[PDB]
């Protein structure tokens, strides 16, 4: 591809001990929807995922455990292809 | 063109639920009613598969033309299998197309 399929600048913009507000910069191409995944870092806990529409570039993650390291990833879904993910770690 | 996966599924439509037989071919996803009749199809290169957790164990397929269709499936595992198989094949599909009336007949016949 001639432009990146991946979002940029994934970051936690606000946090409580059990919830995170994340933001990312959309890729150059219109996205059908995004997938957000989160799970305990290294913890062999179940990873969970949800979506937000391609018109949104933020999401809230709730129900987390305080003081726990989490790995959060976002990737874009398109007609005909799935984008690669961008990932961050964050400790509640 | 080969058949890779097929299952009964329940389509959620306006005010009703419908039993469909869904077929993943190498280049397209086909939805039929029961002799078979095609309700609709989407080339894989024009499709996006979305997990739906409300209702639970559901998914939505979006077509490049702006339509989308929602199904209940039997389990989270089968739902994940369908997404993975579709993704694997999407990596091998590059060109959008439209089937002629007879092509669809032959396609439905093969079913």
């Amino acid at each position: 591809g001639s432009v990146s399929s991946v979002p940029t600048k994934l970051e936690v913009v606000a946090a409580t001990p059990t919830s995170l507000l994340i933001s990312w910069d959309a890729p150059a191409v219109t996205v059908v929807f995004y997938v957000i995944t989160y799970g305990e870092t290294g913890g062999n806990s179940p990873v969970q995922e949800f979506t937000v529409p391609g018109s949104k570039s933020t999401a809230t993650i709730s129900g987390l455990k305080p003081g726990v390291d989490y790995t959060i990833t976002v990737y874009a879904e398109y007609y005909g292809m799935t984008g690669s993910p961008i990932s961050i770690n964050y400790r509640t | 063109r080969q058949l890779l996966k097929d299952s009964f599924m329940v389509e959620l439509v306006e005010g009703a639920r419908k039993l469909r037989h869904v077929f993943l071919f190498t280049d397209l996803l086909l939805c039929t009613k029961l002799q078979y009749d095609c309700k609709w199809y989407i080339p894989l290169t024009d499709l996006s598969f979305q997990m739906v957790d409300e209702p639970s164990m559901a998914f939505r397929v979006h077509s490049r033309n702006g339509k989308s269709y929602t199904f209940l499936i039997s389990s989270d595992y089968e739902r994940a299998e369908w997404r993975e198989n579709i993704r694997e094949q999407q990596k091998k599909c590059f060109r959008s197309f439209s089937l002629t009336s007879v092509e669809l007949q032959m396609l439905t016949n093969s079913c």
Side-chain angles (χ1 to χ4, degrees):
Chain A
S2 55
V3 295
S4 177
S5 70
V6 188
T8 53
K9 315 318 166 202
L10 174 61
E11 59 169 303
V12 172
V13 294
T16 78
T18 66
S19 66
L20 304 178
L21 182 60
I22 58 164
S23 172
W24 60 89
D25 287 336
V29 283
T30 184
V31 169
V32 183
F33 63 93
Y34 298 96
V35 178
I36 293 81
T37 74
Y38 60 104
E40 295 185 29
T41 312
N44 308 288
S45 180
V47 171
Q48 290 167 106
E49 61 177 83
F50 65 98
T51 64
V52 314
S55 52
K56 294 281 199 175
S57 61
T58 60
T60 299
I61 299 179
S62 306
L64 304 178
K65 297 170 172 176
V68 167
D69 199 72
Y70 283 93
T71 297
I72 300 160
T73 84
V74 179
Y75 59 89
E77 290 275 28
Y78 306 90
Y79 303 111
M81 57 162 288
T82 302
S84 37
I86 180 166
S87 185
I88 65 174
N89 300 339
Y90 191 88
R91 190 185 295 271
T92 51
Chain B
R1 175 181 291 155
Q2 309 307 322
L3 174 62
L4 303 179
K5 205 177 223 290
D6 69 295
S7 181
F8 289 112
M9 302 185 183
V10 169
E11 193 181 351
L12 303 181
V13 302
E14 302 83 352
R17 301 188 180 94
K18 301 287 179 167
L19 181 56
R20 308 293 202 207
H21 194 163
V22 175
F23 297 86
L24 175 59
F25 293 92
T26 37
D27 62 345
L28 64 88
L29 184 71
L30 170 65
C31 182
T32 72
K33 172 172 197 83
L34 313 98
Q35 196 62 11
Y36 277 110
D37 280 288
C38 160
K39 300 303 307 187
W40 51 258
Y41 74 99
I42 310 169
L44 294 187
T45 192
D46 296 327
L47 179 148
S48 179
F49 187 105
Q50 181 185 13
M51 301 288 192
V52 174
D53 293 312
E54 176 55 54
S56 70
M57 266 178 286
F59 65 90
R60 176 166 297 123
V61 281
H62 304 265
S63 171
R64 200 183 286 282
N65 65 23
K67 288 282 297 111
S68 78
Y69 309 89
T70 304
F71 290 95
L72 301 184
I73 192 157
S74 58
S75 64
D76 283 339
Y77 167 68
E78 211 54 52
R79 186 176 63 164
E81 285 206 87
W82 274 83
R83 180 166 69 179
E84 193 47 42
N85 268 266
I86 284 161
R87 282 175 172 184
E88 279 306 325
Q89 296 307 309
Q90 283 182 315
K91 288 189 193 67
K92 309 173 189 228
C93 295
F94 307 110
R95 303 271 304 104
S96 182
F97 57 89
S98 189
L99 293 175
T100 75
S101 193
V102 58
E103 289 178 324
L104 213 52
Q105 196 169 32
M106 304 179 62
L107 175 52
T108 55
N109 285 344
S110 65
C111 294

